[PDB]
Amino acid sequence: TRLSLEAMLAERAMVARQDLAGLKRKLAGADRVLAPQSPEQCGRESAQAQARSVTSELKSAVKEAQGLEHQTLDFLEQLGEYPVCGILHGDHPVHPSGTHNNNGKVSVKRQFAASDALTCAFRFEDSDLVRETALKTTYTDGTWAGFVQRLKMQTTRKCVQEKVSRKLLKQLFPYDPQKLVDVSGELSELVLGIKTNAIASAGPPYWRTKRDALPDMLDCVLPLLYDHIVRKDLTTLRNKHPELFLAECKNKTDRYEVESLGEKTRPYFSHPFHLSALVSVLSQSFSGALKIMTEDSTSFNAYGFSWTNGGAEDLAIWARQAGEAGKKPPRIACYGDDTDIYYRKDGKLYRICPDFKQMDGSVDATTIEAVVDYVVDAHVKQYPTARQFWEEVGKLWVEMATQSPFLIDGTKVYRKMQKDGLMTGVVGTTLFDTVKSALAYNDWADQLMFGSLNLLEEKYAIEFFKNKHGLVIKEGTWKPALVNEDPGFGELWTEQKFLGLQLKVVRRENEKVYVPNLPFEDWLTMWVTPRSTETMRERTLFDRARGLLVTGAVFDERARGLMGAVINSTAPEVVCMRVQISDGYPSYDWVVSLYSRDHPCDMPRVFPEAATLIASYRKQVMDTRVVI
Amino acid sequence: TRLSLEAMLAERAMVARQDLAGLKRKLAGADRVLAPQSPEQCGRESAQAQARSVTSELKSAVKEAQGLEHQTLDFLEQLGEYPVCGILHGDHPVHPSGTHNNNGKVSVKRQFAAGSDALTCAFRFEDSDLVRETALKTTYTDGTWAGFVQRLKMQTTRKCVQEKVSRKLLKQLFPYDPQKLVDVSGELSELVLGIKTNAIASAGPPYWRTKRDALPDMLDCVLPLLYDHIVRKDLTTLRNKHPELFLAECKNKTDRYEVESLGEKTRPYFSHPFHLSALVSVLSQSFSGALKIMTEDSTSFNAYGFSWTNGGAEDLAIWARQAGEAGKKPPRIACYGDDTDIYYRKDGKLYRICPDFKQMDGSVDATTIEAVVDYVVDAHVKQYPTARQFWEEVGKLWVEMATQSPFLIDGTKVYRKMQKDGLMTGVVGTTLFDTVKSALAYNDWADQLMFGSLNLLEEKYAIEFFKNKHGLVIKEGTWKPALVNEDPGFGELWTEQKFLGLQLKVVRRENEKVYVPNLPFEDWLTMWVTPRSETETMRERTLFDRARGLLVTGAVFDERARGLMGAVINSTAPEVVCMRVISDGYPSYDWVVSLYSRDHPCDMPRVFPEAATLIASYRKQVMDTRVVI
RNA sequence: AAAUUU
RNA sequence: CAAAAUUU
RNA sequence: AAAUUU
RNA sequence: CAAAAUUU
Ligand SMILES: O=c1ccn([C@@H]2O[C@H](COP(=O)(O)NP(=O)(O)OP(=O)(O)O)[C@@H](O)[C@H]2O)c(=O)[nH]1
Ligand SMILES: O=c1ccn([C@@H]2O[C@H](COP(=O)(O)NP(=O)(O)OP(=O)(O)O)[C@@H](O)[C@H]2O)c(=O)[nH]1
Ligand SMILES: [Mn+2]
């Protein structure tokens, strides 16, 4: 009741942005700063019909592939059935009563189920292109057949142990010791500091979101785990409550090639919240301290690299200092299985952008153990009072990464027969892949110095990584290319992709700004396969179009036109409504600014008078000093 | 959707306090710090039945009194009918279609309706005969036509006396800090945006909706129009073209009324246009913020701003004691509207009078009103001279609203007060105007004591004096001088009289004396059973809040009232105590004593000390990572 | 809430 | 969405 | 949101 | 709740 008028106006503002009908009415006359758009190609009805037709074909293709028989799970170790956890937190079990329980045994059921975006594509683009694009890739749960095949490939690959030491990791993966979290502090506070996905599964035995399981984890399971860690008593705990150390093997819903649905569906592992949270203390602290290649010339690390705020140009600057192959250091930087390589032949700069196939399967136990050691050691050198505890956590970490028992479908509990091979989904997954990859390329570079310059060639490179590192180069990814070291306006560094994107130079006045880029076809693939009321659907179209523009679609003339069309199609009320109000849009100029070294600024408003129109008030200066 | 666990816990905490069902489950049986309470007298069904029975009698009494004929409104000037305002703000009229409009004329309909959980609680925990007689004596009601018109006439037609007043005299009685005054030479929009108001109060004509709903129409449309016409000396053009912009509504106040006197007494007030009140509030609120009170400055007669808390109750006593021998040295006099505390000595002994004026607004003369407006405007322009002319124009509007505004009552007929004298209660500054008139009269009273007229201490001559010399009527039985207990014993009263509706009492804390407000049980009980007013939960929560409020105001210092409020508090379900709406605390005796003392502020004690952790299902446990393994 | 990436 | 990096 | 006061 | 003062 008793409120200042200023405050009252603010309250009215918030409330107003929730009333769609009122927004629609107040914005109805407003000047709209339209995005650049390409013209319509056909009407709603035709576009919907074409979308329906494509969706219908995809649905049958997916349903057929999902119907395929899957091969036996004999390649895994069998450990029988596990009893459901009996642990109570107050008046309820930590494992909910009616869930994931077949006659007292833990059970799971894999889901393999069978577009607004697609309609937009047909509305604004050539039918044949949209149709062939939409029929090649689909966002899907995948297939049993594909799931099991990839699982086998991930769990039974012949690996090679890397030759690694702390000295070598210090060189390739330098970090700032002062940025490491003081893990000598009290454990509860440290755990409370970790970030996570609130709606991700908390794993066994919570069988609900991390948000829902949080109290059960912190108040009940974590102290129990701590007590048993510090008393060297984990085996008692494991035997009495096996579900506390159980993972779930899941099929990843993803953008999969329709052609290969029955051969390829990615598995990952969801671990218990209490274990992942504990390991995250070390892992997230270490991530925060890690340098990237653009900050330290010895680092092979791109885990942490950003294209924005000069990053794209930093990559180029870093790359150019690469030396003559066999004489001076190349420039190599790794992010998981994805690597950018620069070297000179007769002073000319070359680039390779190779990838590894099902890489996690090739990550050897030595590399995993060395990475855990390096992270643990980094912390205990800086905070020595807590050495023993964190070494124990180190052991759990390694176990989760290599040997965790797991469910797939039903009650049968499996384990990977060999220790080698990374259990994708463990905390630190990406770091493990990055390190394995970097050790291999570090060895590769050493061999160049010893004179073996034929390792620059596809044939010998593929042989080398297979034989010497147990790593499989993805077909067609070893294609050295002459780099455009100083690109012209609108020209590319090379046609190759690193971290899914090409590097290009665009003009601003007479300056060159380095920005990400892809051909239209790639942007279109992303557009028509979203990674998923009428109002929320309309708003999602708006948001996805903005996102793609920002990522680099704005620098492709056809993609920019498509995204702009979608943006301009979004009703004013949907643009301006309160959301989890973002009523700006990525203009070309703003996106260029984002990738440049400019100070951060807000996206331009779609409706510049929205604030005042929504409030039904535009301030007018009234001077109290006037002569009367 | 990626957050820290700490943040996730915080989100869960906020959500949890809104999930009543979950709160109910988690706090069921929780360790509860019970308030002191008197025992149950009867159960709910019996108490509800008794409440129903009392409510039924009150309803008939009110309905009968509302049926009484009212006297004609011929004592006011008639101005005919006003056309509804045609001003548009964008796609809508400022005066909404189909409201307050009788065939194109502004119209209004007075509401006198004949419409308790509180009463049920009273019966649950107190003697039936006492609750019943208490509840039948006072009711919260719209009042009556008969009573409304009688008080309206008394307010608009009283023979007033012009005060002898000047800036010099007001500086003396109403000192202020000039440095606290708002810089009113700033830009107008910013100044207006800075005023506080009641969001759900009527915005008046021509908006005919809440201030919250009318705010854009006011700021964006009407206020600039008003400003343009002010600065061009063109207000009469505006008045003629859009009369509704300068129209008030005369309304009946819903209030606690004696059932006996329903047909004789219902308070009238005036609701003015938002644009005019907002403008004047810039000056008035600024001035209120600068005003000193009697406990800060020995010359001040002003209690507008006084607080009983944080030593205030003791400050009153300290201030009072320095009163001198009547006819030799200054008394101690302090005014808040029509309510005044007076201290003097006869043969060195301290006496107290707590007189009140009857329908005081009717007695406030136009000279006093004009002087107060001048004093406030001048205070600002002395500090910020660049804006003199504008604020003098606002000064003129201010006077017009407080003495001569045209107004509706019921139907389309527009009235005006025939005489300029008499305050139109509801204008911005209402309380200050009353306070000043009252203080001028008492200042004169005190002067006459010095000139030798010591019989003005006596009821007979005091009443005569205020009537004849100031046009003010002392309410009967409010002039009763009393020997003050200057150093009160533990549990003793300063005197039995009320100032600002409360007695002053001394309570013991260890071996210290703390000065606190107090009333007899019957008064607290009257307040309890007549709330100044939806789920069962919100009703239960309101009971909890009213019980706490009364305790804090001083009910905690009466044994039976403390017991009643405590019983209500202890009856409140845990979920209702702990839900999102300080909130989950209760006023213990010790905490309330601390509030009235000069102690630093602290939170009320928790009803459920471990509520936070129980609700979260998490108690932090220290786990040491430095352990040897 | 959204986009890209691994 | 299992862990994650980069964006607004 | 709530109590008292004018 | 017409303007308000004090308080939680
Ligand atoms: O969502 C993801 C995608 C990829 N990765 C990591 O990326 C690495 C390789 O990805 P992958 O092992 O999942 N299969 P992939 O190599 O993509 O097969 P292909 O279709 O031939 O390219 C693995 O080591 C994963 O751990 C993730 O951790 N999460
Ligand atoms: O709710 C209120 C009460 C009082 N007042 C103002 O304060 C003045 C005195 O306040 P008052 O409330 O004590 N009563 P008064 O009308 O003088 O006589 P009576 O009814 O017999 O006790 C009134 O005359 C009004 O101007 C208000 O503005 N609002
Ligand atoms: Mn990959």
Numbering used by the authors:
A (entry chain A): 11 to 124, 129 to 546, 553 to 600, 624 to 671
B (entry chain B): 11 to 125, 129 to 546, 552 to 599, 624 to 671
What does the paper say about this structure?
Thosea asigna virus (TaV) is a (+) ssRNA virus that infects the larvae of a defoliating moth (Setothosea asigna) and the prototypic member of the Permutotetraviridae family. In a previous work we have structurally and functionally characterized the non-canonical RdRP domain of TaV (TaVpol: residues 1-674 of the ORF1 product), showing close resemblances with flaviviral RdRPs. In these enzymes, motif C is located upstream of motif A forming a noncanonical C–A–B–D arrangement with a unique connectivity of the major structural elements of the active site. Here we report the X-ray structures of TaVpol captured in three replication-elongation states, revealing high resolution mechanistic details of different events in the nucleotide addition cycle for a non-canonical RdRP.
In addition, a stalled Δ10TaVpolΔ607-624-RNA-rNTP ternary complex was obtained in the presence of the nucleotide analog uridine-5’-[(α,β)-imido]triphosphate to catch the TaV enzyme in a distinct catalytically relevant conformation. The addition of a non-hydrolysable UTP was used to trap the incoming nucleotide in the active site, before its incorporation. The UTP analog was placed in the active site in an equivalent position to that observed in previous structures of RdRP catalytic complexes. In this position, the pyrimidine ring formed a Watson–Crick base pairing with the templating nucleotide A+1. An extensive network of interactions involving the ribose hydroxyl groups 2′ and 3′ were observed, stabilizing the position of the UTP analog in the active site. The side chain of D374 (motif A) was repositioned to contact both the 3′OH group of the ribose moiety and the T438 side chain (motif B). The ribose 2′OH was also recognized by T438 and D447 of motif B. Despite the addition of the Mg2+/Mn2+ mixture to the crystals by soaking, only one peak of extra density was identified in the structure to position one ion. This metal ion was located close to the side chain of D351 (motif C) but far away of the triphosphate moiety of the rNTP analog that was salt bridged with the basic side chains K488 (motif D) and R280 of motif F in the rNTP tunnel. Only one metal ion was observed in the catalytic site of this structures (Mn2+ A), leaving the metal B position empty.
